[PDB]
Amino acid sequence: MKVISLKGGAVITLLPEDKEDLFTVYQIVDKDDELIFKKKFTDLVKLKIKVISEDFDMKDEYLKYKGVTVTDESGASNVDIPVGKYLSFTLDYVYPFTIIKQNFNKFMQKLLNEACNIEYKSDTAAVVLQEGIAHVCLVTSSSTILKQKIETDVLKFDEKTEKFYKAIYSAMKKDLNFDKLKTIILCSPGFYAKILMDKIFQYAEEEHNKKILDNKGMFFIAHCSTGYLQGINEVLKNPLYASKLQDTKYSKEIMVMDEFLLHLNKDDDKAWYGEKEVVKAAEYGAISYLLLTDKVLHSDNIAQREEYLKLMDSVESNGGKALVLSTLHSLGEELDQLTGIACILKYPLPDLDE
Numbered sequence: 001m002k003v004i005s006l007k008g009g010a011v012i013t014l015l016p017e018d019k020e021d022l023f024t025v026y027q028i029v030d031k032d033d034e035l036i037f038k039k040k041f042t043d044l045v046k047l048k049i050k051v052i053s054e055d056f057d058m059k060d061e062y063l064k065y066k067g068v069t070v071t072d073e074s075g076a077s078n079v080d081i082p083v084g085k086y087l088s089f090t091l092d093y094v095y096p097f098t099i100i101k102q103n104f105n106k107f108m109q110k111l112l113n114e115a116c117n118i119e120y121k122s123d124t125a126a127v128v129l130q131e132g133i134a135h136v137c138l139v140t141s142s143s144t145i146l147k148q149k150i151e152t153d154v155l156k157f158d159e160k161t162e163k164f165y166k167a168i169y170s171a172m173k174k175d176l177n178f179d180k181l182k183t184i185i186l187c188s189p190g191f192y193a194k195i196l197m198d199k200i201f202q203y204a205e206e207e208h209n210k211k212i213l214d215n216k217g218m219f220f221i222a223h224c225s226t227g228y229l230q231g232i233n234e235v236l237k238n239p240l241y242a243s244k245l246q247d248t249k250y251s252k253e254i255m256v257m258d259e260f261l262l263h264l265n266k267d268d269d270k271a272w273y274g275e276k277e278v279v280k281a282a283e284y285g286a287i288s289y290l291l292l293t294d295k296v297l298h299s300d301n302i303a304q305r306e307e308y309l310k311l312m313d314s315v316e317s318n319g320g321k322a323l324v325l326s327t328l329h330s331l332g333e334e335l336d337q338l339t340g341i342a343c344i345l346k347y348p349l350p351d352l353d354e
Contacts, residue, residue, distance in 0.1 A: 001115035004096055010104045014112070015096040018141050019061045022091060024115045026056050026063060027298045028108045034100035035065060036077055037089050046077035049087050058328065063091040103302060105309060123249070124183045125176050127168060129192045130227025134168045136175050137232065144232045147175035154191050165199040172200075178211050178218075182249045187222035187231050197221050217251035220244065250331060256289060256323055257331050260344055269350050273342030275307075277352040281343050282311055289344040290315045290322040293332050296340035297324065308341070320346075 001021045004013040016022050029035070029051060036048045049067035056063050066088045072078045089097075114120045118140075126137040126144070131154065136147040148171040150164070176184075186193045186200075197219060204212045222241065224231025235241055247254065263271030272281055273291075281287050290312060299305045312322050325332035327340070335342060 001112065001121075002096070003112065003116055008104075009100075009102040012099040012101060012104070012112075013096055014099070015093075016063075016091055017093055019058055020121065020141065021115055022056075022061060022063045023058055024111050025091065026054070027111060027294055028101070028104070029054075029065060029099060030101070030103060030298075030302075031300065033102060034070065035067070035089055036072075036098040036100070038095055038097075039087070039089070045079070045081070047081060047087060047089075048072050048077045049089065065089045107297065107309060107312070119177060120180045123181055124185065125172075125181050126185045126187065126232045127172065127193075127196065128224065128227050128229065128231045129168070129188045129196060131190060131192060133227060134164075134196070135227075135229065136168065136171045137229070138176070139232065139236070144229055146229070147171070154195070162199070165196060166203060168196060169200060169203050173209070173212070178215065182218060182251065183220060183245065184218050184248075185220045185222055185232070185235060187224045187235050188227050189223065189225055189231075192227065193221050193223070215251060217255070218248050220248045250329070253323065253325055253331050256291070256344075257325075257334065260289075260291065260342065263344060269348035269352075270345045271343070272345070272349075272352055273338040274353075275304075275339065275341055278341055278343045279307070279311065280352050281345055281349055282314055284349060285318045285320075286345045286347055286349055287315045287318070287320040287343045288346050289320065291335055291342045291344075292322065292324050293327050293335050293340035294324055295327045295332075295336070 001017055001024060002015040004015065006012050014025075016025050031051055031053070033051045034048060035051060036046065038044050039047050047069065049065070049069050051065045052067040054063070054065055066086070069078055069081060069083050069085050069087050071083050122138050122140050124139040126135075126139055128135045128137065132151060134150040136150065138145050138147055150167050150171055186197050188194075188196065200212070201216065222231075222235045224234045260271050262268075272278060278287070278290070292308060292312070297305055297308055315322055325335050327333055327336045
């Protein structure tokens, strides 16, 4: 993503760069917002509309806003174009547009800002190693960009192995961002990947590096024919691997949705759902984990989402954390089945429903 300018409300001029940015745009543009762009029906012309509805298909890489045109007295658009007609805008990755936005919030601003960081984007890191070489890597939305070229029986200790590993190790916690990643792949022709995996978790407890130890489930071990850059792509497109590329991607959400029901199924009073019950649990300050969907926070009810934003800070300003789940995926679709809002508590709050 690229934000050209940006100057309550606001005026955002921005450029979506891939389908991951189309989704970002999706959660920002609101009904009644206004949109300056270019269309043709070299006969291109600058148009402008008040948004009315949306057509979104991430798989199809398709975002379209339907709306009616409006007066732009700056003449800077809608020239010769009669005000009041129907007109739509299909997003393209080529020309930027401007959003005259009314309720731009810090949650939206976080997402947009994050989308711009071409690091914060990439959420899959690799490490490929033949029997002597390793590559700390970063899988980007197009390229498998390298971060650091490091260099029988393969199962027995050695001083030049246990030096080598700690190198990969460090080179990783240096060249990599475990906050913004969701998946880390270790793949190797041979035992090398597995060996690298444990050496990693070995040194972790030495440093007590809970940034890695907390996420033992973002790591994925794989085989590939060569320990060169080739390997990454054998795995990415290997179907017997696909499902479990997802299980690691959502390691955290998978874990959080777990405990939520652990409590919920023990008729346990430590887990709840419903706008009502969660706002109350917030009054006690008892929330360890707030669970919201992306849908409920970009609701049409602009009133209702004022509440939920407060609830997010409120909850964290109090030593609890928050989690936005995508209704485009199983966990979000499930949290959906529960009104897109629920929580986990620090203690049992009997009868928050009475």
